[PDB]
Every structure is written in C-alpha cells, then in structure tokens.
Amino acid sequence: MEIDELTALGGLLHDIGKPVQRAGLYSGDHSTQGARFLRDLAENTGRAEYELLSLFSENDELMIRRIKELSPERFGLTMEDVLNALWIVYEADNLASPQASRPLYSVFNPGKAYPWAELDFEKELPVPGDVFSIRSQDYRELVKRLWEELSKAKLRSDRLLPVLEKYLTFVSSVTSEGNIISLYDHMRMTSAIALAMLRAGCTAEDGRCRKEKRFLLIEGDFSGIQDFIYRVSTLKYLRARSAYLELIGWDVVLEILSRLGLTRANVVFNAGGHFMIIAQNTPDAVKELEEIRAKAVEWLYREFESDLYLAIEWEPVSGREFGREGNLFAEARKRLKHKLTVRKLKRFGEIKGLFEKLLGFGRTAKNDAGVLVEGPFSGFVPYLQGGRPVGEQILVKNTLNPGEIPESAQFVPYFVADYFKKDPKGGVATFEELSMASTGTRRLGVMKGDVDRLGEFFSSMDSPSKLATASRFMDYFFKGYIGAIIEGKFGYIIGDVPSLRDWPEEPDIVVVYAGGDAFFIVGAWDQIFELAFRVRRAFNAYTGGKLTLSVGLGYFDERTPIYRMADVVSERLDTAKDEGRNRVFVVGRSRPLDGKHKLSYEWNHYEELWRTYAPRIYAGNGRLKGKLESKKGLLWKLLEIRELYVRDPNDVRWAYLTAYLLSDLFPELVGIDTKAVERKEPQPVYWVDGVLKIVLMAVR
C-alpha cells in the first residue's frame, strides 16, 4: 500500500458497514459492524490489507494502539500517515453529505422510492414506486454477493468501484424519509474529496481543509459537437464520429486523473461531452491543468481546424462550498459555469498563431502497433473477443465486470447506447435500408430528444453525492435503457402509444447518439414516430412523472443529407421547448400567425387525439379502417376544410362545411367549441392534421 491508494480505498469503504447492520449479522453499530466485516474478510483468502481498511469505519487513545497493533511497515506506511488517512476520510464523509428497512427515495421524486435490485440494464427498468420496506433477508443475500466479489477483486479503486456500483447503487446512504443519495455515489464522492485533501497536502486538521480553498471544481465542456458530427461531405461514419468524440473525452479525463494522481471516483460525471472532476488546489495541479488544457486545444485545432473545441475551466473551492449554509455548491457551480461561457466565447484563445465484434479499447502510446484512432494524449487499440488488451488503461464497453484482462491494467467501464438494425450482412443498416422498411411512404424517421430544465434540476442538488446520483441515473436512462425500449421491453410500463404497426422483434432503428440528457435516433419513419412516445412514457416512469422530454420528429427522403435533416429536427425540437416544454413536434403544420397557435403538441394532448381519431379511420399494419376503403378522399377534404380555418380562424365556414362533408364519424369537428372561444385557444379542427397526415403517410 501507499498513502494515496489507502485514503482512496479508505473513503470508498468508510460506509461499507451500513449494508451489514441492516442485514443484522454482527453485534450492532455500522461503524463497529463495518470493521467486523473487513477484518473478517481480510482473514478469509488471507489478504492483510483489508484489516488496515477496517479502521476507517470507526481521545485517539484506543485507535493509535489498534493501528500500532497492525504493522504499518509490513505494507510500507508511517503510523502518523494512517492517523491522517482516518481523519481525512472522516471529514470527507461530512463533506459529501431512521429505520433499518427504509428504501432509496428517487432523486427525481423524493415522495416515491426504488425497489431493491442490483444494477442490470438487461433486466427491468428502475421505476420509483411505493415505499416498500426492504427485508433484512434481502440485505443478507446482497452482503453475501458483495463478500464473494470483494474476495476475487484486486484491491485497486478501479476493480473495487465496479462491484460497489453493481450492488450498492439502489441502497439508501441514510435511511431517513425522502433520502435522495445512493450509497455508491456517497462512497465514490468521499473517496474523491478524501484523496483531494491528501494531494492538497492538508493534514492534522479538525478546519484548514474545510474553511480554506484547498479543492478544485474542474469542469470541461466540448463546444461545436453538433457541427463536428452533423456537418460532413453515411450513417456508419456519423456513428464513428460519435464514438470517436467519446474516446477523445475519456483521453482528456484519464490524463487529468493520471497527472493529478487521482482516481475515477474523482469524476463526478462524464456525459454529453461534459465532464466534472473534484481535485486538489496545489500550484502543481493548476500548472498541470494548464499544460493538459493547452495541448488538448492545440491537438483539436490541428485535427479538426476550428470545428470541435474543448473549454476547460476550474474554480478554487472550500469544504464549506460542498453543502448548505442558510446552497453554496450550486452557487460555486454557477461561478464555474460563468467561467466556461467566457472560455467558449474565446475559442482557441490558447493558440496565438491563430490570428496570423470488439469489447472495448486499450489506451497505449500514440506510436504503437494496431492503433486505430488517436486522442490528444494517447492512442486507442481496439480490444476484440479473441485478442489481448494492450495499454495502461483499458476502456471496456457495457460491463462493470473486468472479464479476462491483465491484473496490472486500469479498468475503465464506459456505457454507450449503440443499438442498430443489422443488414442481411453483419454490417449496420443504411439510410436506404431503414427508409424501405417503413409502413406506407418510404421515408427515414429522424428524432432529436432533450430533457427539459435539467440545468434547474442539477442546480437544486445540495451536495456532491446528490449531484453524483442525479447525473449518473440521468445519463444511465439514455446509455443503459434506450437500448431496451427499442428492443421492445417495458411493454406494461409504457402501454398503449401512438403506433402504425405491430412492434417488430428486430426493429429498423439505429441509435446515432444517446447519453447525458439527449438522443439522436434514425430509422423507418413510422417505427421512429412510435419510439418517440415509447421513450417519453419510459422517461415519465423512470422519473416520478416529475421530469419531461421535448422531441423534434422529421420524416425525409432517404437521399436527404444528414446536415439538413439534423438542422430541421433541431429547429423543430427548439420550437417544442420554446412553445412551452413537455411537448413533441410530430409533423410539419400550417397555422394562423396570430400567436395563439403552436406547431408542437403536449405529449398527453397528442396521445389523447391519437386514442380518439386513429381507431375510427385506421385498421392497423398499413391498412385503412374497412369502412373507409374507397372513402379515403374524406380525410383529404377534412385537411382541405382545416386549411380554411388556418386562412382565417374566426370565420365559422369550416363548422358548417365539415357538417355537409359528413355523418357520425368526427362529431368533434362539426361543432363550434366555445371553451376554446372562452380560453382563447384553437378550435379542435386545428389539431386534427397531426393525426390525419401520419395515417395518410401510413396508408400509401
């Protein structure tokens, strides 16, 4: 052991006594019961280092003696060193911040709470439900799985984080009412703040690390992502650019972790090309950050002209500013956000010459055999099933299980939403392959979705551990579960959505990107139209119905360029958010320009309109309701009649005409809705085109 690895693993196990107390195995208190777990685990398999980490769970009298009992030399540490580690880890627990069955209350809805289950994207969708008290029986089976995994784990933070995340993610850090924080997040945030204090140099303090600015909030946001990806000369390439921006991001984050001597625990989040790191406020750190920042920006300019920029800024911060005093953390994030907005308005100001089959990737040197693509710092060798992993760090895809890689490799698990319809060949489907598989008109569906007021949501979080949970769960819906929603899972939880066909077993969809709080997805226009509502329902369930999406849908000719498509759906998503939020841009629409008529629909408003009109004119699977075969012209005459309401909204001609046009079918349009006249809202006729034009597209 060294003092660095000890404090890291220390703060990461200060609260591994909470799962065993509630299991009720040892005599009593978690601080005591946590020591009797690690000391017990140390003896079995016979790994001495666990009995040194057991002290963290607990007038300095009995402690100095219990440390002296243990050999500090056997490992290669001082006694004075281990006292600092314990006092550092003790305070860290405070900075990251009752019954033995209370579950984890959802960050999204503190009123609702999570049923005990271990993190698995393949099975089930986390839905905050009723406050079901967790059995002491359940915590025992958990601790028995935790025991077995920790035994075979290689006692580095990179092999210990993956097991703590698997098991202790859906576990209340404290068992109070409306407790938001996951245990794993509180454990990884303490390991972060603790190691930050050690590197900061501060020692024997009990407020030189608390009231003194010895921490750095490092925040790095990519700018020009949209341009870098959706502005080229195919879908394969478009996918490759998204994957490459991921590896570039990891390369910069891992270099900051490497040179500051930190661990992945110090990464508060890395999602949507936006990363945050807690670190030390040493003259060494600020100097090393400037060198990393400078070289990263310079590489990005040589490689991609001015297309893709990386804005890296850091704010010095005290222990005070990690919590509440009358929200200092949010205000400290706000000062740093401001620093970023200015840096993004100084694109490449750090360059003066300006104004004159695989499982993952191995992070090796640039000059190395089999390097497929290069980052600003390192090269990336693909890691195949039958191959051997090559590099100091190994980025492994969609597993927390290290698998079969060397014991001397830094394990770095990365999740990427990468669902795709396979061709008649092993390769991914093209825009033509997807556009041809559509019910009716042969068009490519493009949908761009974004979570509403996420900036406000994250800004409400008091503590690092609150933000840690908020960010991880948020990112995990998109990276983890959008894969599942496309496959066809959560059918009960979603339910009846606007659809034009029976959901396929291998859907003609291709994820371009899904991560952070956003997605870009292409496929058969009708399958994309349905996925929009599936994703939104799953999202309403995944949150406590307390957060909303906005979506922009587009249906184009297969031969349309990516940049026009991306431009249209972006414009349509921007409208959806601007016309109030929690709404979808379903299709292009004619409207009066009197400022009373919106193009986007409220999700529930549209879902209600589909429920009402679709069954009366649509049989399903591309066919028109048997009663309308040869009476289709009626639907066009309705669109024709609606267009007269668009020309002048006040004139009633439409109400009387529609009447003679029909008779039973569409009783909603033959009248003059006076609630709409009162509330100064559009007449029902205005909204019909959202349903008809989709049906008319499906029946060609």
Q: Which residues of the chain form contacts with Mn ion (CB under 5 A)? A: 450-451, 454, 517-518
Q: Which stretch binds another protein (CB under 8 A): 51-59, 279-287, 349-357, 654-662?
A: 349-357
Whichever of 100 and 454 has its CB closer to Mn ion, that residue is 454
Whichever of 352 and 675 has its CB closer to another protein, that residue is 352
Counting Cα atoms < 13 Å in the Cβ hemisphere of 278 gives 34
Q: Which stretch binds another protein (CB under 8 A): 3-11, 336-344, 358-366, 379-387?
A: 336-344
Whichever of 121 and 348 has its CB closer to another protein, that residue is 348
> Residue 207 binds which entry of Mn ion, another protein, none, with Cβ cut-offs from 5 to 8 Å by kind?
none
Distance CA 172, CA 184 (A): 9
Distance CA 312, CA 481 (A): 30
Measured from the CB of residue 343, what is the shortest distance to another protein in angstroms? 10
> Residue 211 binds which entry of another protein, Mn ion, none, with Cβ cut-offs from 5 to 8 Å by kind?
none
Q: Which of helix, strand or coil describes residue 692?
A: helix
Measured from the CB of residue 559, what is the shortest distance to another protein in angstroms? 9
Q: Is 498 within 8 Å of 615 (Cβ atoms)?
A: no
Q: Which amino acid is at 57?
A: S
Is 574 among the residues that bind another protein (CB under 8 A)? Answer: yes
Whichever of 407 and 456 has its CB closer to another protein, that residue is 456
Subset of 270-309 contacting another protein (CB under 8 A) = 305-307
Distance CA 682, CA 463 (A): 45
> Residue 451 binds which entry of Mn ion, another protein, none, with Cβ cut-offs from 5 to 8 Å by kind?
Mn ion
Of the residues 325, 404, 407, 456, which one makes contact with another protein according to CB under 8 A: 456
Is 442 among the residues that bind another protein (CB under 8 A)? Answer: no
> Residue 578 binds which entry of another protein, Mn ion, none, with Cβ cut-offs from 5 to 8 Å by kind?
another protein
Q: Is 216 within 8 Å of 317 (Cβ atoms)?
A: yes
Structure tokens at 693: 């034009």
Of the residues 61, 98, 130, 355, which one makes contact with another protein according to CB under 8 A: 355
Q: Which of helix, strand or coil describes residue 103?
A: coil
Of the residues 345, 358, 634, 659, which one makes contact with another protein according to CB under 8 A: 345
Distance CA 122, CA 133 (A): 25
Measured from the CB of residue 581, what is the shortest distance to another protein in angstroms? 9
> Residue 94 binds which entry of another protein, Mn ion, none, with Cβ cut-offs from 5 to 8 Å by kind?
none
Whichever of 48 and 342 has its CB closer to another protein, that residue is 342
Is 133 among the residues that bind another protein (CB under 8 A)? Answer: no
CB burial readout 233-242, b (16+ within 10 A) else e: eebeebbebb
Of the residues 177, 557, 643, 651, which one makes contact with another protein according to CB under 8 A: 557
DSSP state of 314: E
Q: Which amino acid is at 89?
A: V
Of the residues 109, 560, 590, 612, which one makes contact with another protein according to CB under 8 A: 560
Provide CB contacts within 8 A for 129, sequence distance 6+.
Answer: 112, 113, 114, 115
CA distance readout (Å), 349 to 82, 304, 311: 45, 16, 10
DSSP state of 594: S
> Residue 454 binds which entry of Mn ion, another protein, none, with Cβ cut-offs from 5 to 8 Å by kind?
Mn ion
Is 354 among the residues that bind another protein (CB under 8 A)? Answer: yes
Q: Which of helix, strand or coil describes residue 374?
A: strand
> Residue 151 binds which entry of another protein, Mn ion, none, with Cβ cut-offs from 5 to 8 Å by kind?
none
Torsion of CA 432, 436, 440, 446, to 10 degrees: -40
> Residue 31 binds which entry of another protein, Mn ion, none, with Cβ cut-offs from 5 to 8 Å by kind?
none
> Residue 355 binds which entry of another protein, Mn ion, none, with Cβ cut-offs from 5 to 8 Å by kind?
another protein
| Residues closing a segment before a gap in the chain (C–N exceeding 2.5 Å) | 58, 97, 206, 233, 326, 356, 662
> Residue 450 binds which entry of another protein, Mn ion, none, with Cβ cut-offs from 5 to 8 Å by kind?
Mn ion
Of the residues 144, 236, 287, 338, which one makes contact with another protein according to CB under 8 A: 338
> Residue 144 binds which entry of Mn ion, another protein, none, with Cβ cut-offs from 5 to 8 Å by kind?
none
Distance CA 586, CA 208 (A): 57
Whichever of 306 and 401 has its CB closer to another protein, that residue is 306
Question: Which bin fits 523, alpha (ψ -120 to 50), beta or left (φ > 0)?
Answer: left
Instruction: Order the strands of the 444-451 sheet from edge to edge.
Output: 509-515, 518-524, 444-451, 549-556, 583-585, 601-602
Distance CA 634, CA 621 (A): 21
Of the residues 152, 211, 564, 647, which one makes contact with another protein according to CB under 8 A: 564
Residues that bind another protein (CB under 8 A): 305-307, 338, 341-342, 345-349, 352, 354-355, 453, 455-456, 557, 560, 564, 574, 578
